[PDB]
Symmetry: none
Subunit: 178 residues, 2 copies
C-alpha cells in the first residue's frame, strides 16, 4: 500500500485531501480529538507508515510558493507545544521560505542550488543513515542529510501558510550568477 497522511498526527489547522495524499493550511482550526501523536501547535503531519530499517522512496509534489517544508522525522519528534523546526528536534527537511529553497540545517539553513521545484524524490536509507532529495525533472541532487537515526523514521510534511501545499506520490535562481 502506498503512503498516505496520518490524520491522527495532523495539526488541526491543516486540511488533508479526501484521498489523504495532500495537505494544505486551512483558515480555521478543526475540532479534532486530542491525540498524543497530534502536532498541536506546529503545522505538521506524518505519513501513515514509518520505517525502522531498509531503503525507501517516495515523491512529493510541491507548491510553487512559500510555506512548505518536508522530509523525515524521528518518531520521538515532539508533538506538543511550539517547537523549533531543526535537526536538533529530529526533523531533516527541505523548505521553501523567503522565495528561496533551503535544506533546513542549523543554526543557519543551507541554500539549495536548483531550479524551480515541482516534484522531489526522497530516498531514505536507514541501513546507511541518510536521507537524500532529488529534483525529478533532471534528477539533480538537492541535499543529503547523514544521520544515525537510531529509531523509527516517518515521512514528515509541514505547511505553515495558505497558498501552497504538499502532495505525496509513489516513487517513480542560479542564473543570477551567469
Amino acid at each position: 500500500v502506498t503512503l498516505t497522511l496520518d490524520p491522527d498526527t495532523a495539526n488541526p489547522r491543516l486540511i488533508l485531501s479526501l484521498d489523504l495524499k495532500g495537505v494544505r493550511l486551512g483558515e480555521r482550526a478543526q475540532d479534532l480529538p486530542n491525540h498524543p501523536c497530534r502536532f498541536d501547535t506546529n503545522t505538521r503531519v506524518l505519513a501513515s507508515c514509518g520505517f525502522s530499517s531498509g531503503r525507501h522512496h517516495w515523491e512529493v509534489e510541491v507548491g510553487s510558493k512559500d510555506g512548505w517544508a518536508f522530509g523525515v522525522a524521528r518518531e520521538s519528534v515532539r508533538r506538543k507545544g511550539l517547537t523549533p523546526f531543526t535537526p536538533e528536534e529530529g526533523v531533516w527537511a527541505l523548505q521553501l521560505n523567503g522565495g528561496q529553497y533551503w535544506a533546513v540545517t542549523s543554526p543557519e539553513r543551507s541554500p539549495l542550488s536548483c531550479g524551480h521545484l515541482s516534484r522531489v524524490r526522497v530516498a531514505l536509507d536507514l541501513e546507511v543513515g541518510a536521507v537524500s532529495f532529488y529534483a525529478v525533472e533532471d534528477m539533480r541532487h538537492l541535499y543529503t542529510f547523514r544521520v544515525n537515526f537510531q529509531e523509527r523514521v516517518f515521512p514528515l510534511f509541514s505547511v505553515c501558510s495558505t497558498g501552497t501545499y504538499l502532495r505525496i506520490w509513489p516513487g517513480g535562481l542560479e542564473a543570477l550568477f551567469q
Copy 2:
C-alpha cells in the same frame, strides 16, 4: 473610472502621490483646510468614489513594513477626534502590524497565516453584502467580511508609521512567517 484618493478626506499628516494613487505617512502635518470630511486625528484617507450598489474591484500594492491598513469604510465613519479602528466604527480592513497580517475583527483581531503580501485584490459586493480580499499572485483568499451594508461604502486606506505605503492599482515579521513550521 479608476479609483483615486480624495485629498479633502486625508489626515493632514499623510502625503499623497501626485497621481492620487499612493499614500504614505509624512513627518509633519500639512496646513490644509478644515472640512467635515477630513480625518483630523486617525491617519486615514478615502477614495473619491463611493458605492451604494453593485460589485467593484480594485487592487492595492502594499509595503513590506508595518503601519498600513486598508479595506472599505461606511460613509458615516467618524472623521473627528481619535476613533477606534474597528468594524463597529464602520471600517472593514486588513492590517500589517507587529509583523503579522490581520483581518481587523473586534474585540480581537484575526491573525492571517497568508504568507508575504505584495498586492491585494479587494472585491466589494454590495448586492450580497460582502467585502473580500485576495493575494493577487495566486488569488488565495485572505478574508471576507460579510456585512449587510446599509449606506454608501468607500475604499479606505490608513498609514500610521513612516517606512511603509499603500498604492492603488486597477482592478486587474519576515522570519516569523515560518514560526509554526
